[PDB]
Amino acid sequence: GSSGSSGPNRRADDNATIRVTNLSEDTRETDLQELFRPFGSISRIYLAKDKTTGQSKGFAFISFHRREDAARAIAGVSGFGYDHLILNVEWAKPSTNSGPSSG
């Protein structure tokens, strides 16, 4: 069970953002940069960290440049064998919409 806390107002409606959960203690930003690289060039890599412990909470958020490169990961990372475990990934934003403007 992972607490469901939130603060950083992240209003992503178009930008490429993906969420990650079930990470390891040996999984840092540099470890993810090479994991989501095979898909393309990552723009930013966020990782949940504590202030009292100063460690990796367990989840992270990778930001892609294009909508395709971002999806490429969510598809692969899904069911990956990271640290002998089942990594979890999903679009940071909800699928409320059903096809935005075309162009």
Curated annotation (Swiss-Prot):
Protein location: Cytoplasm; Nucleus; Cytoplasm, Perinuclear region
Disulfide bonds: none
Domain RRM: 16-94
PTM-bearing positions, type Phosphoserine: 41
PTM section of the record: Phosphorylated. Phosphorylation is enhanced upon serum stimulation.
Assembly mode: Component of the eukaryotic translation initiation factor 3 (eIF-3) complex, which is composed of 13 subunits: EIF3A, EIF3B, EIF3C, EIF3D, EIF3E, EIF3F, EIF3G, EIF3H, EIF3I, EIF3J, EIF3K, EIF3L and EIF3M. The eIF-3 complex appears to include 3 stable modules: module A is composed of EIF3A, EIF3B, EIF3G and EIF3I; module B is composed of EIF3F, EIF3H, and EIF3M; and module C is composed of EIF3C, EIF3D, EIF3E, EIF3K and EIF3L. EIF3C of module C binds EIF3B of module A and EIF3H of module B, thereby linking the three modules. EIF3J is a labile subunit that binds to the eIF-3 complex via EIF3B.
Functional summary from the UniProt entry: RNA-binding component of the eukaryotic translation initiation factor 3 (eIF-3) complex, which is required for several steps in the initiation of protein synthesis. The eIF-3 complex associates with the 40S ribosome and facilitates the recruitment of eIF-1, eIF-1A, eIF-2:GTP:methionyl-tRNAi and eIF-5 to form the 43S pre-initiation complex (43S PIC). The eIF-3 complex stimulates mRNA recruitment to the 43S PIC and scanning of the mRNA for AUG recognition. (Microbial infection) In case of FCV infection, plays a role in the ribosomal termination-reinitiation event leading to the translation of VP2.
UniProt family annotation: Belongs to the eIF-3 subunit G family.
Protein name as catalogued: Eukaryotic translation initiation factor 3 subunit G
Gene encoding the protein: EIF3G
